Amino acid sequence: MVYQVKDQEDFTKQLNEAGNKLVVIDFYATWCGPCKMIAPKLEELSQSMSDVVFLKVDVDECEDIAQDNQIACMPTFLFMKNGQKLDSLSGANYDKLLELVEKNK
Amino acid sequence: MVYQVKDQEDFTKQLNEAGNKLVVIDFYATWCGPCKMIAPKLEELSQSMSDVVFLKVDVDECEDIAQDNQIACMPTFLFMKNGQKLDSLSGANYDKLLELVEKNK
Amino acid sequence: MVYQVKDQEDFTKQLNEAGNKLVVIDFYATWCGPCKMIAPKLEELSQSMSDVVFLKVDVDECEDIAQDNQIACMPTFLFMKNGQKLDSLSGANYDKLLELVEKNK
Amino acid sequence: MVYQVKDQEDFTKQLNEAGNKLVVIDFYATWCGPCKMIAPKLEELSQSMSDVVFLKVDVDECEDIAQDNQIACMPTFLFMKNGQKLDSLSGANYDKLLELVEKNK
Numbered sequence: 001m002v003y004q005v006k007d008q009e010d011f012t013k014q015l016n017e018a019g020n021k022l023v024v025i026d027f028y029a030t031w032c033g034p035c036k037m038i039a040p041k042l043e044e045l046s047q048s049m050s051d052v053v054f055l056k057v058d059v060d061e062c063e064d065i066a067q068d069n070q071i072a073c074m075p076t077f078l079f080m081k082n083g084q085k086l087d088s089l090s091g092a093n094y095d096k097l098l099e100l101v102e103k104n105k
Numbered sequence: 106m107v108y109q110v111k112d113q114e115d116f117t118k119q120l121n122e123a124g125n126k127l128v129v130i131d132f133y134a135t136w137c138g139p140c141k142m143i144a145p146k147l148e149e150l151s152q153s154m155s156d157v158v159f160l161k162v163d164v165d166e167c168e169d170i171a172q173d174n175q176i177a178c179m180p181t182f183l184f185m186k187n188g189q190k191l192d193s194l195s196g197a198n199y200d201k202l203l204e205l206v207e208k209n210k
Numbered sequence: 211m212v213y214q215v216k217d218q219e220d221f222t223k224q225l226n227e228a229g230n231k232l233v234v235i236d237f238y239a240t241w242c243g244p245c246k247m248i249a250p251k252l253e254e255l256s257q258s259m260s261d262v263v264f265l266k267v268d269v270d271e272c273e274d275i276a277q278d279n280q281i282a283c284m285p286t287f288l289f290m291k292n293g294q295k296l297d298s299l300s301g302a303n304y305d306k307l308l309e310l311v312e313k314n315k
Numbered sequence: 316m317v318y319q320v321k322d323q324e325d326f327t328k329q330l331n332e333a334g335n336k337l338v339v340i341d342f343y344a345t346w347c348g349p350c351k352m353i354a355p356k357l358e359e360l361s362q363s364m365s366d367v368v369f370l371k372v373d374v375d376e377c378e379d380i381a382q383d384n385q386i387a388c389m390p391t392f393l394f395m396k397n398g399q400k401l402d403s404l405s406g407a408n409y410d411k412l413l414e415l416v417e418k419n420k
Contacts, residue, residue, distance in 0.1 A: 031164065031172035059136065060165050067136035073178035073195075090178070124227040241374065241382035269346065270375050277346035283388035283405070300388075 026056040032074040034092035143197040248302040347389040349407035
């Protein structure tokens with residue numbers, strides 16, 4: 001399942017909760033077509049990979065987080081591990097997302 | 106001057122008032138860095154080109170309009186004339202914006 | 211400034227560009243004395259009232275438009291808003307014209 | 316039958332041709348509804364009264380004549396006899412037209 005970050009404090013809580021696991025955060029908007037298309041794939045990845053944590057941030061609900069993370073395209077995937085930014089991916093490119101997951105997990 | 110469209114009907118109203126003029130629409134968000142980066146240039150352009158209508162849509166304020174135009178990367182510049190789409194530009198490339206204005210005005 | 215409509219399509223175009231503004235249309239003829247008598251006043255009015263659109267139709271040049279609006283006595287002032295008729299005034303009565311502009315703007 | 320005056324010289328020829336008869340001249344336009352409604356009545360009057368001459372002037376074809384006669388409303392009926400103006404009637408008022416004919420013939 002893909003947990004929706006509620007605010008900044010929640011984002012920190014989820015990063016802590018992840019432990020040493022790679023965290024993949026999907027920055028998305030409800031008005032964004034490509035975001036909707038890929039969400040089910042993310043949910044499936046979420047249900048299958050136990051060594052990765054998947055989160056999502058609705059940019060219209062968390063504009064502060066969107067701004068702090070310099071989001072410009074939807075969806076954007078941020079790859080973090082032990083609080084550190086490892087990679088970013090702009091757009092709904094599933095294969096590239098998978099490559100980054102395999103590489104950083 | 107770059108007019109901010111308030112909602113779907115207002116968007117339609119502005120498109121009619123444009124008459125036969127090229128209309129350039131900036132889909133943006135207040136949390137978007139490149140959007141803020143190019144905004145002043147659009148404003149300067151609009152003060153000079155009285156034969157082109159410049160509009161802006163805050164995607165957080167008008168999520169329905171954003172969905173209608175499948176916005177993904179911001180800013181997005183949509184070029185229209187007589188209510189019909191002519192071109193689209195993703196990202197804050199000022200030279201490309203001028204080229205498309207030149208082509209379509 | 212009082213714009214001269216060139217034909218049926220041009221009339222439609224101007225009515226759209228008016229947006230939500232009162233549109234006042236002077237149906238006139240170059241052989242009509244009272245028409246020429248009031249024309250300069252309409253022009254002066256139009257220079258002041260930027261919130262009202264002033265148009266003129268030469269009935270000899272656009273006989274089809276004249277027929278569409280069953281013009282009979284000239285000048286005739288037709289008052290429109292959003293493509294729809296609001297009022298009509300036959301003859302060059304400046305005070306009546308101002309009253310109708312005031313009522314309908 | 317109602318003869319259509321072709322130009323100024325023709326108007327003088329027809330006034331001469333009328334002799335001592337009352338002449339009723341219908342100033343009209345093809346785009347004018349009330350003009351069309353009453354024309355058949357004029358033709359009937361024309362076919363029945365042998366002591367009156369009926370003429371018509373299309374204002375779009377004879378703008379000079381329209382101007383010289385200070386026409387402003389359609390139809391306008393001018394009543395002449397032996398070259399002299401006796402009366403004018405603005406509008407499609409058949410009873411008033413008949414009164415003026417009976418009075419001046």
